Design a protein around this ligand. Structure first.
Ligand SMILES: [Cl-]
Ligand SMILES: [Cl-]
Ligand SMILES: [K+]
Ligand SMILES: [Mg+2]
Ligand SMILES: [Mg+2]
Ligand SMILES: [Mg+2]
Ligand SMILES: [Mg+2]
Ligand SMILES: [Mg+2]
Ligand SMILES: [Mg+2]
Ligand SMILES: [Mg+2]
Ligand SMILES: [Mg+2]
Ligand SMILES: [Mg+2]
Ligand SMILES: [Mg+2]
Ligand SMILES: [Mg+2]
Ligand SMILES: [Mg+2]
Ligand SMILES: [Mg+2]
Ligand SMILES: [Mg+2]
Ligand SMILES: [Mg+2]
Ligand SMILES: [Mg+2]
Ligand SMILES: [Mg+2]
Ligand SMILES: [Mg+2]
Ligand SMILES: [Mg+2]
Ligand SMILES: [Mg+2]
Ligand SMILES: [Mg+2]
Ligand SMILES: [Mg+2]
Ligand SMILES: [Mg+2]
Ligand SMILES: [Mg+2]
Ligand SMILES: [Mg+2]
Ligand code: NA
Ligand code: NA
Ligand code: NA
Ligand code: NA
Ligand code: NA
Ligand code: NA
Ligand code: NA
Ligand code: NA
Ligand code: NA
Ligand code: NA
Ligand code: NA
Ligand code: NA
Ligand code: NA
Ligand code: NA
Ligand code: NA
Ligand code: NA
Ligand code: NA
Ligand code: NA
Ligand SMILES: [Sr+2]
Ligand SMILES: [Sr+2]
Ligand SMILES: [Sr+2]
Ligand SMILES: [Sr+2]
Ligand SMILES: [Sr+2]
Ligand SMILES: [Sr+2]
Ligand SMILES: [Sr+2]
Ligand SMILES: [Sr+2]
Ligand SMILES: [Sr+2]
Ligand SMILES: [Sr+2]
Ligand SMILES: [Sr+2]
Ligand SMILES: [Sr+2]
Ligand SMILES: [Sr+2]
Ligand SMILES: [Sr+2]
Ligand SMILES: [Sr+2]
Ligand SMILES: [Sr+2]
Ligand SMILES: [Sr+2]
Ligand SMILES: [Sr+2]
Ligand SMILES: [Sr+2]
Ligand SMILES: [Sr+2]
Ligand SMILES: [Sr+2]
Ligand SMILES: [Sr+2]
Ligand SMILES: [Sr+2]
Ligand SMILES: [Sr+2]
Ligand SMILES: [Sr+2]
Ligand SMILES: [Sr+2]
Ligand SMILES: [Sr+2]
Ligand SMILES: [Sr+2]
Ligand SMILES: [Sr+2]
Ligand SMILES: [Sr+2]
Ligand SMILES: [Sr+2]
Ligand SMILES: [Sr+2]
Ligand SMILES: [Sr+2]
Ligand SMILES: [Sr+2]
Ligand SMILES: [Sr+2]
Ligand SMILES: [Sr+2]
Ligand SMILES: [Sr+2]
Ligand SMILES: [Sr+2]
Lengths: 337, 53, 132
RNA sequence: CGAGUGGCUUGCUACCUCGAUGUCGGUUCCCUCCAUCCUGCCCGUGCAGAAGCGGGCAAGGGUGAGGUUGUUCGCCUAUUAAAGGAGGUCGUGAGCUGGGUUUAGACCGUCGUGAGACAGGUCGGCUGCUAUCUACUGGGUGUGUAGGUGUCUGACAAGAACGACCGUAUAGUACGAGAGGAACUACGGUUGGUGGCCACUGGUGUACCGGUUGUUCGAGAGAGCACGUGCCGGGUAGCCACGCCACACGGGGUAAGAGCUGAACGCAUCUAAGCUCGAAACCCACUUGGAAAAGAGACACCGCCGAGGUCCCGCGUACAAGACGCGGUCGAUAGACUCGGGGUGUGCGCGUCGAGGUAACGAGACGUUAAGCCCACGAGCACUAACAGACCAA
RNA sequence: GGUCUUAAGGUAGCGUAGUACCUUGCCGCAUCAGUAGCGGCUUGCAUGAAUGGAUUAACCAGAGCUUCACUGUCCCAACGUUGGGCCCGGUGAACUGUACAUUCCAGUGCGGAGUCUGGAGACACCCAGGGGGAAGCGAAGACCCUAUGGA
RNA sequence: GCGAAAGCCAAGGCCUGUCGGGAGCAACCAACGUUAGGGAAUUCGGCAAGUUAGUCCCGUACCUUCGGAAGAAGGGAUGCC
RNA sequence: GUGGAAGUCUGUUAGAGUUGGUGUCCUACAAUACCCUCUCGUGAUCUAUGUGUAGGGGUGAAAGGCCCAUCGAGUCCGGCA
């Protein structure tokens, strides 16, 4: 009778093409509530290990008991909020108005940008504050970059640059807050933004797998029984009915799979530290050793080891925060074996 | 916990526990041990085992 | 149902033949259905530790044979995961015949039972000799 | 009895096609319709409750597994929130199947003097093609906007990114004589769907290590062949699912419906103007694509004798070509080496033992030996190789 | 009906059959559930004695059914091996071609349109792909009817 | 080894079942290896694949034309010194 | 116990054949091929060469099979434009 069955794969993550920027780009930011503050940070994926935690959930039958939890280790050294960009509201949406830069730049930012030699931070600030007076000011964001050099396991030195919105109290106050960070040198850390136990949304470009067929790429069945021995094993039944006389873009076909941007919601931050406590014996496979600022994210994170991952305060958390979970054990057993 | 087979310590958050027919219980640290046990080999007769050692 | 307290990889399907761990007179049971389950196209309905299932008696006493009864899976060969990460697996797949109220039809259970199961069906537990 | 709508059944017609548009059923994969089976929100009841029964809005999602039969259909079984129906050349054979129908062989019953026949039954019985165009899934090169780097905007576009269930508290409460027996709300979990990931468990692993059969190199040692591992055991990286993680609340506008104010019609009236509410449905929220959006975009800095770029070289977080990303002595990018971290399971040789045997000989055991062999990982380390160098450029 | 056509009026056996339309006949077995299968019943639409009946050990790449064992047939797919596929040197065909051709949604039309009408969309070229459409290519339809055709 | 069987090796013949080079070498296809738990649920149908296997000892039903059925079935053993 | 019969059994001995895969191929290696599975293999067996039967005629353990890629009446040329 032709039983029903959901379609193969989601139509919400396409087209399934190769990502334009390996550096993830958030398409949304948290709401403005608490004191002003940068709404995101970044780091490089290292690998996974597991930890043993004391159950936090006050609604759990296991509250207060040992619990093994998988963790992905992300090296999160300090970043540099190098500039302050202002957006003005226009009939055609938000548009960049101007930027306020600094003087102190990391020694290798010149591997990506044409660092400013002659800039005027006051004319820019002036224009911005004037825009606020006029009431045409759109959100405020910081031009941020990473310091790959601080991470030995990562070969690159060329910083990765991304823009991160600044949210918070009143615009006047966060505008002032933004200028403060920038002017210093822009140096800020994971602490300044997140606290262990909070929920973050992680974004990253998935592991690439080049071209793959419909079975792997879309999860369609393989031909079954006798149908698998006639010359077709991993090909779909048909590309569509007689009419419409065309192939719809909705039918599962071969193509690029992997290396797509993905934003994974509600990842609990288990612990933010520095040192080599999470590192693994023999070294993380295909990565290296960790000994410095790091963040332990609960579960999995998109991308291969070494890829740039971005954090943001969760924009749609399902649960309340239970800060600083008690970590009783952090596995350091070799990941080879 | 120690591996009821080779003797080494079992990394927490790891290993398997096999429940025998009569209700007994054997905690294995890895497949290697389980597999040698399945072959009918005794840990004391295998040089690489802590037990043996 | 009440949270089991462990992660289960169903190791049985509709049609699987399993051991009846009790003294009801039924020796072997065949899985016909899984309570509360609804699968997907082409998917064989699966059952594992803790599930209540409808069964038909394949081997046993004349009076029991062919009867269609309810039961509870108490042991399975495919591993399950406990909160602490350890996996647990049994020597066989077994179930216990139970009635409309989930009370064991038999008078004695044979072999060990999983703590997780005992906790969900207390009366079944209050009949077990060993609880692993 | 009367009036209609559909084009799912059947019939009728012979308009299209006989220099051929391959049958039924199934399968796989995609889109849709609503006359709604479930799920959401409602109205009535011969509505106490619980539950039924009937009706309204509503197509977001779901609608599954099995036994006979080629079957469609249908009958039957256990599950289920429910296991709805229909269109797409009765969607789908330049996709599959070939069980039925529908060639040639053969049998039975019936018919026929006979050859032979019979939507009667029965056993057997063939499925060609290297894609030109178009269509779509992905990947490039150019031109246009009109020197370079980095960061963005967001017109538009896609989504189900989420659907459903069980359980606990509420509560043995409301209701009811009792039997029976709710809800709001807050929680825990399961299932189907979705995206990603490998610490854990599992699979693989013709890297690797070991055991061992036949045979050949005289034995030993060490090896070849026995199909891309002779066979067996274990298994690293990697890849994977059977493993693990994540997948809203809340706004805004409505339908059916419940109402407010309110007149035509002094009254009344949810409606005519106005207004308050109100669906899993609509819009927003969230994710993904997106400067070729021809109004062809915005910002900052750098540069026009040089910013930037190409060739070249060492490589992969990338990869069918192309593309992409990193490093190039201001260096740890690759290899060697040594540590570390892993796999296997105790090497050759020698010494003791060894059932025996005059002796020769001797399977095998213990010791040396956590040995030997091996590693697609990490660290250290400039030892080797990233040299030398050529060119474009407002 | 308790003979009549046309000579006789179906005996032993077998029987819902490779023959039974009705039909998934009815009872039973077996299965959670069996239009199947086997046993029984049997008035046989339309069995039946060398148009041979019945029956049957042995035999069978003959048709149907059940059970034990086993298994990636399936749940639900994964990883690996060899040869191709992809890039490079060399060699180097064929099928097919009225023309034009970047199409999509509707409509119209000899009622089944890339080309007509109205809109929508559409910068050119190239690589790989699985085959929706060109009522795709291949063969002057083996079906059906017609011919004062053939065998 | 039962063997004119398999497998390996001589004498003898050959590298001409005659295009090569390159990418850890993707999708997809042809042959094929290994797959946890379930075990025919798949399908018209166990189609395909698999299971069993050589030899010796024990033991072997219905039925039968007394030949057979029969290697019925089922159970045990198997090297080296 | 001897004996060693059999249109007897197993058997890729030679040799003959072809159940299934509806596998590969299907502008092929091939106008009937390839691989695995499968059947026969002391006889109504298989096989070479010679020889005979000729077209409304042969030959046929019978399928309208075969008689030089064609047979419900061969092929060639002629009747014939
Ligand atoms: Cl299929
Ligand atoms: Cl079921
Ligand atoms: K026709
Ligand atoms: Mg590992
Ligand atoms: Mg481990
Ligand atoms: Mg199905
Ligand atoms: Mg006509
Ligand atoms: Mg056609
Ligand atoms: Mg309606
Ligand atoms: Mg009610
Ligand atoms: Mg829909
Ligand atoms: Mg059709
Ligand atoms: Mg077609
Ligand atoms: Mg075809
Ligand atoms: Mg084809
Ligand atoms: Mg048939
Ligand atoms: Mg004939
Ligand atoms: Mg006919
Ligand atoms: Mg047939
Ligand atoms: Mg019968
Ligand atoms: Mg007679
Ligand atoms: Mg004609
Ligand atoms: Mg005819
Ligand atoms: Mg004639
Ligand atoms: Mg398996
Ligand atoms: Mg089926
Ligand atoms: Mg077979
Ligand atoms: Mg002759
Ligand atoms: Na084929
Ligand atoms: Na078609
Ligand atoms: Na009508
Ligand atoms: Na709906
Ligand atoms: Na059915
Ligand atoms: Na058609
Ligand atoms: Na079809
Ligand atoms: Na076909
Ligand atoms: Na078909
Ligand atoms: Na609303
Ligand atoms: Na007769
Ligand atoms: Na025969
Ligand atoms: Na397989
Ligand atoms: Na096509
Ligand atoms: Na040559
Ligand atoms: Na005798
Ligand atoms: Na054959
Ligand atoms: Na003739
Ligand atoms: Sr269909
Ligand atoms: Sr960004
Ligand atoms: Sr966006
Ligand atoms: Sr085929
Ligand atoms: Sr069409
Ligand atoms: Sr035609
Ligand atoms: Sr409607
Ligand atoms: Sr309802
Ligand atoms: Sr039909
Ligand atoms: Sr019917
Ligand atoms: Sr039929
Ligand atoms: Sr017929
Ligand atoms: Sr047929
Ligand atoms: Sr132009
Ligand atoms: Sr309740
Ligand atoms: Sr009561
Ligand atoms: Sr070999
Ligand atoms: Sr063997
Ligand atoms: Sr209203
Ligand atoms: Sr542009
Ligand atoms: Sr009679
Ligand atoms: Sr006979
Ligand atoms: Sr036009
Ligand atoms: Sr192709
Ligand atoms: Sr030789
Ligand atoms: Sr040559
Ligand atoms: Sr292996
Ligand atoms: Sr079957
Ligand atoms: Sr079946
Ligand atoms: Sr035996
Ligand atoms: Sr013979
Ligand atoms: Sr065939
Ligand atoms: Sr085969
Ligand atoms: Sr052929
Ligand atoms: Sr034979
Ligand atoms: Sr002989
Ligand atoms: Sr011929
Ligand atoms: Sr002539």
């Amino acid at each position: 009778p032709q039983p029903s069955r959901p379609r193969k794969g989601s139509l919400g993550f396409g087209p399934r093409k190769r990502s334009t920027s390996e550096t993830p780009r958030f398409n949304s930011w948290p709401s403005d509530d608490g004191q002003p503050g940068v709404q995101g940070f970044a780091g490089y994926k290292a690998g996974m290990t597991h930890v043993v935690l004391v159950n936090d959930e006050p609604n759990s039958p296991r509250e207060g008991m040992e619990e093994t939890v998988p963790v992905t280790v992300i090296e999160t050294p300090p970043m540099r909020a190098v500039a302050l960009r202002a957006y003005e509201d226009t009939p055609y949406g938000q548009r960049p108005l101007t930027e306020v830069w600094t003087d102190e730049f990391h020694s290798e930012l010149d591997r990506t940008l044409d660092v400013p030699e002659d800039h005027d931070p006051d004319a820019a600030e002036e224009q911005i504050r004037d825009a606020h007076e006029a009431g045409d000011l759109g959100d405020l964001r910081l031009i941020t970059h990473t310091v790959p050099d601080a991470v030995p396991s990562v070969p690159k030195k060329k910083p990765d640059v991304m823009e991160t919105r600044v949210g918070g109290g009143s615009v006047s106050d966060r505008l002032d807050h933004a200028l403060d960070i920038v002017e210093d040198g822009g140096e800020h850390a994971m602490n300044d933004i997140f606290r262990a136990g909070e929920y973050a949304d992680v974004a990253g470009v998935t592991k690439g797998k080049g071209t793959q067929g419909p079975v792997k790429r879309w999860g369609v069945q393989k031909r079954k029984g006798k149908h698998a021995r006639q010359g077709w094993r991993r090909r779909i039944g048909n590309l569509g009915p007689w009419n419409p006389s065309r192939v719809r873009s909705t039918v599962p076909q071969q193509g690029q799979t992997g290396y797509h941007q993905r934003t994974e919601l509600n990842k609990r931050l288990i612990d933010i530290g520095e040192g080599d406590e999470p590192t693994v014996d023999g070294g993380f496979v295909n990565y290296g050793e960790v000994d410095g600022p790091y963040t332990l994210v609960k579960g999995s994170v998109p991308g291969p080891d070494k890829r740039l991952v971005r954090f943001r305060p969760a924009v749609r958390p399902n649960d309340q925060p239970r800060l600083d979970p008690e970590v009783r054990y952090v596995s350091n057993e070799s990941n080879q074996g | 916990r120690e591996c009821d087979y080779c003797g080494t310590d079992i990394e927490p958050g790891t290993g398997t526990m096999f429940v025998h027919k009569d209700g007994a219980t054997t905690h294995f640290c890895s497949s290697k041990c389980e597999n040698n046990a399945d072959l009918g080999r005794e840990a004391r007769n295998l040089e690489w085992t802590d037990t043996a050692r | 149902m009440e949270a089991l307290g462990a992660d289960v990889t169903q190791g049985l399907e509709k049609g699987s033949l399993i051991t009846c761990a009790d003294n009801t007179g039924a020796r072997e049971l065949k899985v016909i259905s899984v309570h509360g389950y609804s699968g997907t196209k082409n998917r064989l309905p699966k059952a594992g530790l803790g599930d209540k299932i409808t069964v038909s008696v394949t081997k046993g006493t004349p009076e029991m044979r062919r009867q269609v009864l309810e039961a509870v899976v108490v042991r399975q060969r495919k591993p399950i995961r406990r909160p602490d990460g350890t996996r647990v697996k049994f020597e066989d797949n077994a179930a216990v015949i139970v009635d409309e109220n989930e009370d064991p039809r038999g008078t004695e259970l044979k072999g060990p039972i999983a703590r997780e199961v005992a906790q969900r069906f207390g009366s079944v537990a209050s009949a077990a000799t060993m609880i692993v």
